[PDB]
Amino acid sequence: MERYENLFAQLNDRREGAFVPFVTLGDPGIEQSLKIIDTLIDAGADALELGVPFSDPLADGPTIQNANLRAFAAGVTPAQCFEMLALIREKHPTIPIGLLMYANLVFNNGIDAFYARCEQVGVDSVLVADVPVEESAPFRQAALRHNIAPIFICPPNADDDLLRQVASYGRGYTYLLLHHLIEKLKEYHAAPALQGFGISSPEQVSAAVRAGAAGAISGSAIVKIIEKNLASPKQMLAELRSFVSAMKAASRA
């Protein structure tokens, strides 16, 4: 499928930035998670980045650490996550769905088999948080053989050799984290860049798009809202909707 490419094409023709939220699958439970996700989409999410709960999330700060706790506390397993993903795609045919994974969960039952399952349920991309480009070969190979975009992080400490590698190896979009980076990425024909650097307000989205990025990823601010409204599932959704709408508004200009 060409979900990312189609999205970017539509956004480029509407002179529009992407806004992409992250949430943890099954936080704070499976049913509520499904409803959370439907609220994100209904409120203007251009794409999703979805985490699978893992015992040892090395790249995550406390916000998402606690999201994982909440999910485990509900007994959420990877197989249950794949069930959810299938249900999500069945409801929403065009929205790009990316996973944020830890390597062991991809490697566990075989790398090829993991990516094959992603393709079966209609996932579009996989970012493996603890696999640098240096170790990425078997992951990006399996991803591409199963029509999944392998997503790479371009960090703020990147160099030119890294920029060429990310540009060459990545698909769907480049996960950013400046104009040196954005222009070199384009020069190197990298997948369109999404800024993901602590983006938690509408201006950030605007500022990202202006710098020449294709959009912005809100890797944490969403789970904060989940976190603050646990006792009030109803209000949770309202705040989620409110936030996403604002963020999405900022991308039309």
Binding site: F54, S55, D56, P57, L58, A59, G61, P62, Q65, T77, P78, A79, A103, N104, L105, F107, N108, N109, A129, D130, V131, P132, V133, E134, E135, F152, I153, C154, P155, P156, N157, A158, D161, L162
Partner: protein
């Protein structure tokens, strides 16, 4: 791109977020540089000798092998400043940090010996040291916590995950990714992402080098086997390294069997786990069917880790080293035996190695064998634990 091979066969690698890769590359370059620098080597040798007390004794233990054809020596890392082998490599890593112009130290610990070694090295060498320690460990290691603080270290409790060594390990890595321009991560075992398994081995290899020289002096030949416990792998690889190319010398690593392998409550991933990716390395793990990292178990806090360094996994795979397990009860007996019959109180970690050597002797008491056990630490820290057990079991 690296200067040195990050892998031992299939095992090892650099499984960290992209952001940490410059830190690892920097460290590798500084290490390669340092290893060629006679001035660095002199400095390291000076600290090992005049501060830590090397060389350590090699003690022949006659009482415990009486009436058998086993001759048993103990390599006395229990006598090193700090009370365990951990001190050796912290001195080298502390010098590396300085060479890199870093002024702060991060270190994980569970039991606490590495934390104390990290703190003492930091006190001596003028680095600001923070220790991440699972809250569960902080609770149980008040003594070591206080030693660290006396030595000016900040102990930071870790409540994430299962609030233990693994999560402590995770926390240290998280911090380092954001602070590595100022802070060095002083990893306390021969595991994690390259270049740590290599650095830790090279900064522990004097154990085996001294052992070899000492056994040639006293016995006129190499040992039949050298035996060491395996928590993450540093003391064992430190003992093994200089013997790898001596093909007649057996290399025996001892993982904790806990309440028994069949109970699932152990810390023996090399022989009873399966390969996974965690803590920046591809290595045997204790993991759930689904690929979540399991909690390990051992009476000995120092061995209670659900993985193992990649060089050990490799040496096993090619048959160069053999790995066994020793249960809590076996380790406790070895602890009591050494106290009673040689007047040495061993760390419960080291007691696992001793227990396996005693098994080699007792199972085949007319077999002629010259054994060396790496006595990785002293067991003052364990006297309460042992007391509580002996009292609860009724002795």
């Amino acid at each position: 791109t690296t200067l040195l091979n990050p892998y031992f066969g299939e095992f090892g690698g650099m499984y960290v977020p992209q952001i940490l890769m410059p830190a690892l590359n920097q460290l590798e370059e500084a290490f390669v540089s340092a290893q060629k620098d006679p001035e660095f080597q002199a400095q390291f040798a000076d600290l090992l000798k005049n501060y830590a007390g090397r060389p350590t004794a090699l003690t022949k233990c006659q009482n415990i092998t009486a009436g058998t054809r086993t001759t048993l020596y103990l390599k006395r890392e229990d006598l090193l400043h700090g009370g365990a082998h951990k001190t050796n490599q912290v001195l080298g890593q502390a010098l590396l940090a300085k060479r890199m112009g870093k002024s702060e130290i991060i270190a994980e610990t569970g039991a606490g010996a590495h934390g104390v070694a990290s703190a003492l090295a930091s006190a001596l060498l003028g680095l600001k040291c923070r220790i991440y320690m699972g809250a569960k460990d902080v609770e149980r290691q008040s003594p070591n916590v206080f030693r660290m603080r006396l030595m000016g270290a900040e102990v930071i409790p870790v409540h994430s995950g299962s609030a233990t060594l693994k999560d402590a390990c995770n926390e240290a890595l998280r911090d380092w990714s954001g602070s590595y321009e100022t802070a060095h991560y002083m990893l306390g075992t021969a595991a994690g992402p390259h270049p740590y398994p290599t650095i830790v081995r090279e900064f522990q290899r004097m154990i085996g080098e001294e052992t070899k020289a000492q056994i040639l002096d006293k016995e006129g030949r190499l040992p039949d086997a050298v035996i060491a416990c395996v928590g993450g792998g540093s003391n064992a690889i430190g003992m093994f390294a200089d013997f790898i190319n001596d093909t007649s010398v057996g290399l025996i690593g001892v993982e904790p069997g806990g309440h028994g392998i069949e109970t699932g409550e152990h810390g023996a991933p090399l022989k009873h786990g399966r390969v996974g990716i965690y803590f920046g390395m591809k290595a045997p793990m204790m993991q759930t069917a689904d690929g979540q990292i399991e909690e390990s178990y051992s009476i000995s806090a120092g061995l209670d880790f659900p993985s193992v360094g990649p060089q050990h996994a490799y040496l096993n795979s090619i048959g160069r080293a053999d790995y066994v397990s020793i249960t809590d009860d076996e380790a406790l007996e070895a602890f009591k035996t050494l106290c009673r019959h040689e007047g040495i109180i061993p760390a419960l970690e080291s007691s696992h190695a001793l227990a396996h050597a005693l098994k080699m002797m007792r199972e085949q008491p007319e077999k002629e064998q010259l054994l060396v056990v790496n006595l990785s630490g002293r067991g003052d820290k364990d006297i309460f634990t042992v007391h509580d057990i002996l009292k609860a079991r009724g002795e």
